[PDB]
Design a protein around this ligand. Structure first.
Ligand SMILES: [Cl-]
Ligand SMILES: [Zn+2]
Ligand SMILES: [Zn+2]
Ligand SMILES: [Zn+2]
Ligand SMILES: [Zn+2]
Ligand SMILES: [Zn+2]
Ligand SMILES: [Zn+2]
Ligand SMILES: [Zn+2]
Ligand SMILES: [Zn+2]
Lengths: 382, 76
């Protein structure tokens, strides 16, 4: 019997099995074929991790269906960054603010930030620069990796989707409580752990089932397929590691080209992104040093230019699991000093006691006087 | 900062840029290195076509990130 396997590529390879062959045995067939340790392989059929004691026949593998092999080894923070070095992973990050004109830490904000939009959109937040000579009125927020001591120019991308799973929300795929998790921007705000997110991305990338949006690029919605949920910050795919992320970038460049009308050069090992004019059927792989191959092919048959004539996979998600995996489906607290109840309007954690005899400025989260640490770790709740 | 400009052939150009540099400057820096006119050049990042007027900062392209070079040829 033949099963088509996809392992870190859209190029699927056939594998000879029997109906009574277990998933343990299929992992061994692949392990011997690729020369990788079998105890690191995950088998995915229609977005489901197959139990090893089950046989090929039990898994409803029918004929030439796609089985994915994915190789996997073994303080309060509102912000997470992708640290490119030396962490080479997602880390709790520190929010920092500066004046947009002089780029100094002299900007005094009107009110502090309450949501991601305030700190991600340029010139959204207003203030007053306290430098000797600077008429700066807008604020520039940046992030830094919190895991280690940082150089002022050593900034990191904020991965706004990642959250400390303080709430104990079960993951949509495996129904486990993990931390940190990814929170999709679908209405339900479905949560997936970073391990299931890895399986979701790597398999979808193998099937070329990532979505191309002209003004966004190459992305993926919520696992559950919720509308208007495409990951907007595409550096979130850095979570997959540099090899998978580079593969995602390549496939994205290829989709973009084909979505832009061009073609990819048909020659073996070329695959150059070429954009011919609407009425051109003779396409030459132009470019000197590269993308120089530099073959003149037909835009239609993809053979050497002549004068004459010439399995979409479903990612299975449990309805009960999607219901439990929702981020949002505690009004007033007393002031730490005077015990007068203070109400919280919006996301900002910087509280101001209204009581005239008090007027204490404290952190809603910690119950301590306002400070630069509370600002960097959790200026606003998420 | 250094950035890489990769072609789908696998050709790689290393560029010394700054976050404030526009897509136009990147294209001009590519012309100085490989002699490809900017009108033929198309740059892509995470599947999005990068528009001339926008800077690298606007696309959050980090130190040592790669851009994809695709060609609009004339003849076609
Ligand atoms: Cl769940
Ligand atoms: Zn770090
Ligand atoms: Zn200033
Ligand atoms: Zn959803
Ligand atoms: Zn999970
Ligand atoms: Zn070619
Ligand atoms: Zn033809
Ligand atoms: Zn008080
Ligand atoms: Zn605090």
């Amino acid at each position: 019997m033949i099963v088509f396997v996809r392992f870190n590529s859209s190029h699927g390879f056939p594998v000879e099995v029997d109906s009574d062959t277990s998933i343990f045995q299929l992992k061994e067939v692949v392990a011997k074929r690729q020369g990788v340790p079998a105890d690191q392989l995950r088998v995915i059929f229609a977005g489901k991790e197959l139990r090893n004691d089950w046989t090929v026949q039990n898994c409803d593998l029918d004929q030439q269906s796609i089985v994915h092999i994915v190789q996997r080894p073994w303080a309060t923070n509102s912000f997470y960054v992708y640290c490119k070095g030396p962490c080479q992973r997602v880390q709790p990050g520190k929010l920092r603010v500066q004046c947009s004109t002089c780029r100094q830490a002299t900007l005094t904000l009107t009110q502090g930030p309450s949501c991601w939009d305030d700190v991600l959109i340029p010139n959204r937040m207003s203030g007053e620069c306290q430098s000797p000579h600077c008429p700066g009125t807008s604020a520039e927020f940046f992030f830094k990796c919190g895991a280690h001591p940082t150089s002022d120019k050593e900034t990191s991308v904020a991965l706004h989707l990642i959250a400390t799973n303080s709430r104990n929300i079960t993951c949509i795929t495996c129904t486990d409580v993990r931390s940190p998790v990814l929170v999709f921007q679908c209405n339900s705000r479905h949560v997936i752990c970073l391990d299931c997110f890895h399986l979701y991305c790597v398999t979808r990338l193998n099937d070329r089932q990532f979505v191309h949006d002209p003004q966004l690029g190459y992305s993926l919605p919520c696992v559950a397929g919720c509308p208007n949920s495409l990951i907007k910050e595409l550096h979130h795919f850095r979570i997959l590691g540099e090899e998978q992320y580079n593969r995602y970038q390549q496939y994205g460049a290829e989709e973009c080209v084909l979505q832009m009308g061009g073609v990819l050069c048909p020659r073996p090992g070329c695959g150059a992104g070429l954009l011919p004019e609407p009425d051109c059927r003779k396409v030459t792989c132009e470019g000197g040093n590269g993308l120089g191959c530099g073959f003149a092919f037909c835009r239609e048959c993809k053979e050497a230019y002549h004068e004459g004539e010439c399995t979409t996979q479903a990612y299975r998600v449990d309805e009960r699991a999607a219901e439990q995996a929702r981020w949002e489906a505690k009004t007033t607290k007393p002031c730490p000093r005077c015990h007068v109840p203070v109400e919280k309007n919006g996301g900002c954690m910087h509280m101001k006691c209204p009581q005239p005899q008090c007027r204490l400025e404290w952190c809603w989260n910690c119950g301590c006087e306002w400070n630069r640490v509370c600002m960097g770790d959790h200026w606003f709740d998420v | 900062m250094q950035i890489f400009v990769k072609t789908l052939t696998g050709k790689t150009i290393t560029l010394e840029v700054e976050p404030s540099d526009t897509i136009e400057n990147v294209k001009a820096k590519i012309q100085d290195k490989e002699g490809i006119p900017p009108d033929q050049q198309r740059l892509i990042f995470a599947g999005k076509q990068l528009e001339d007027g926008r800077t690298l900062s606007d696309y959050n392209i980090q130190k040592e990130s790669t851009l994809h070079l695709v060609l609009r040829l004339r003849g076609x």
